[PDB]
UniProtKB/Swiss-Prot annotation:
Assembly notes: Homodimer. Interacts with MARCH8. Interacts (via cytoplasmic domain) with PHB1 and PHB2; the interactions increases after priming with CD40. Interacts with CD28. (Microbial infection) Interacts with adenovirus subgroup b fiber protein.
Function: Receptor involved in the costimulatory signal essential for T-lymphocyte proliferation and interleukin-2 production, by binding CD28 or CTLA-4. May play a critical role in the early events of T-cell activation and costimulation of naive T-cells, such as deciding between immunity and anergy that is made by T-cells within 24 hours after activation. Also involved in the regulation of B cells function, plays a role in regulating the level of IgG(1) produced. Upon CD40 engagement, activates NF-kappa-B signaling pathway via phospholipase C and protein kinase C activation.
Subcellular location: Cell membrane
Post-translational modification: Polyubiquitinated; which is promoted by MARCH8 and results in endocytosis and lysosomal degradation.
Domain of life of the native organism: Eukaryota
Gene name of the record: CD86
Tissue specificity as recorded in UniProt: Expressed by activated B-lymphocytes and monocytes.
Name of the protein described by the UniProt record: T-lymphocyte activation antigen CD86
Location of the Ig-like V-type domain: 9-107
Glycosylation sites: 9, 23
Disulfide linkage: 16-86
Taxonomic source organism: Homo sapiens (Human)
Length: 110
């Protein structure tokens, strides 16, 4: 289990741990990040960020980097500690197929 540690009011990079052996391009994928309570942190629909699914709890605090397949969670709260998940779908003309998953344990120290 990937364990991350950051401090209160600081920042954290939640790793998606996607080698991309599938060699997909972002324009063909749908990337989601949700917390232990299945709340959306960030969503990148076929390459474009979609904020109408993001929970207010995260509005303005996330930023996804495709180069590293990492979501950056800003302005950490002691309440942000917990388990997070990266979920990547390959959107086929039909619908979607899940091709990846990873969890990260974020510890926020005061």
């Amino acid at each position: 289990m990937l364990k991350i540690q950051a401090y209160f009011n600081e920042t954290a990079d939640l790793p998606c741990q996607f080698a991309n052996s599938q060699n997909q391009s972002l324009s063909e994928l749908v990337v989601f990040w949700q917390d232990q309570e299945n709340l959306v942190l960030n969503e990148v629909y076929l390459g474009k960020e979609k904020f109408d699914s993001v929970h207010s709890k995260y509005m303005g605090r996330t930023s996804f980097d495709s180069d590293s397949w990492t979501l950056r969670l800003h302005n950490l709260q002691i309440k942000d500690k917990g388990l997070y998940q990266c979920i990547i779908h390959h959107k086929k003309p039909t619908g979607m197929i899940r091709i990846h998953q990873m969890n990260s344990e974020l510890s926020v120290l005061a």
